[PDB]
Amino acid sequence: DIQMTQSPSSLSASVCDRVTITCRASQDVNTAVAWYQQKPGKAPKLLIYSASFLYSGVPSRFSGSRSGTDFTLTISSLQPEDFATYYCQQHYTTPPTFGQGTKVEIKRTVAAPSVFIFPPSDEQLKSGTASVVCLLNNFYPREAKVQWKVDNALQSGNSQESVTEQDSKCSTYSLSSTLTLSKADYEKHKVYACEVTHQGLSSPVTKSFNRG
């Protein structure tokens, strides 16, 4: 109806860096805009109401200004607790319409993973399957690859990569690769390995096992 066009859709700034998010209203809304912070899989949290006002309890880093139809949330000092998606919302009319959201990530010194290798359970072998885990812990940046070289083979069928969201104190991601194998698959092979080359490493470091 009245659309709020929010930029940018994606961001990366290191601590205390100055941060500006901009939402522009297709029509004049007056002062009838509010700014919100939705942390990973929590509900939205009001930072700023009436365009410029700071919700009680919100830190002073956060600020809001208007330029007629152009609106700005600024964080003077970006803190890692600040990692969220930030939303503008107009409420001058019905419907209330929100921005497409700005997702803020925190640049931190390079930090390499803590690779662990885990086997398929005897109650998992009993269930009649055989799924293997390769846990890269607390590492920055995001980008890396988990190559499973089971009995020295590179199998594109199985690879399933769930990453956690930036930690709110370190801003290291963690990643799980899982080898999808019906027990039939697994019965034969014995040596099993997952290999990783990251921006934290001067060497790809492998973590392997054998059945005993």
Binding site: A34, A43, Y49, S50, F116, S121, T178, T180, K207
Partner: protein, 221 residues
């Protein structure tokens, strides 16, 4: 306490229906406007409808109109979303929010959100299998063990390590959907090599739709 507590959100077959309620604590609802906003998974926030409990006057987003109906029971201090004829579009978390009494028309308070999953496929309960922190998993010392929710539908699973006693270095990985169309994740926690044979390390997976609560311990053998 000014608390909103959602309910109703489970799995619904497409064409289906589903009643969502929002509990009101620490204020009376006649005083304000109540709102239902949904957040499709990965996608942004979308407003759905609102209501003035006092006169029961209600406006509705056109993306739902004639299908959803917003209502309230001043008695119980509660508001409801009856959602009919659901489409997989409608698959999303539904938050109720409020409007700060009068002349403070912002969403100061929001519910935790209830997940509606608009799919035909059945409600599989989860397998729980513990993790072996062998001699290929120690850092010499501070080493890692875990769990693995193997098969479930629909989202989500509440994993508690030692019933929330254990917090630190608990990474519970986003769910990843399987070739099967069944969800699997992987819950992990880091410990020193010596406290493998000290304390009881137990992730207590809960798949709430499949009223399953399997509490599997992690042993080192």
């Amino acid at each position: 306490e000014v608390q909103l507590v959602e309910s109703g959100g489970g799995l619904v077959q497409p064409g289906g229906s589903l009643r969502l309620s929002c509990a009101a604590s620490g204020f009376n609802i006649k005083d304000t406007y109540i709102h239902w906003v949904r957040q499709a998974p990965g996608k942004g926030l979308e407003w759905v409808a609102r209501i003035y409990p006092t006169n029961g006057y209600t406006r509705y987003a056109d993306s739902v109109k004639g299908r959803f109906t917003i209502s309230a029971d001043t008695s119980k201090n509660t508001a409801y979303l009856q959602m009919n004829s659901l489409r997989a579009e409608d698959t999303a978390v539904y938050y109720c929010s409020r409007w700060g009494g009068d002349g403070f028309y912002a969403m100061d308070y929001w519910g935790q959100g209830t997940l509606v999953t608009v799919s035909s496929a059945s409600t599989k309960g989860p397998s729980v299998f513990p993790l072996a922190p062998s001699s290929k998993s120690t850092s010499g010392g501070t080493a890692a063990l875990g769990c693995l929710v193997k098969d479930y539908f629909p989202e989500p699973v509440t994993v508690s390590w030692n019933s929330g006693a254990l917090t630190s270095g608990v990474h519970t990985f986003p769910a990843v959907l399987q070739s099967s169309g069944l969800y699997s994740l992987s819950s992990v926690v880091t410990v020193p090599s010596s406290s493998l044979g000290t304390q009881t390390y137990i992730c207590n997976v809960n798949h709430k739709p499949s009223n399953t609560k399997v509490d599997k311990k992690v042993e080192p053998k």
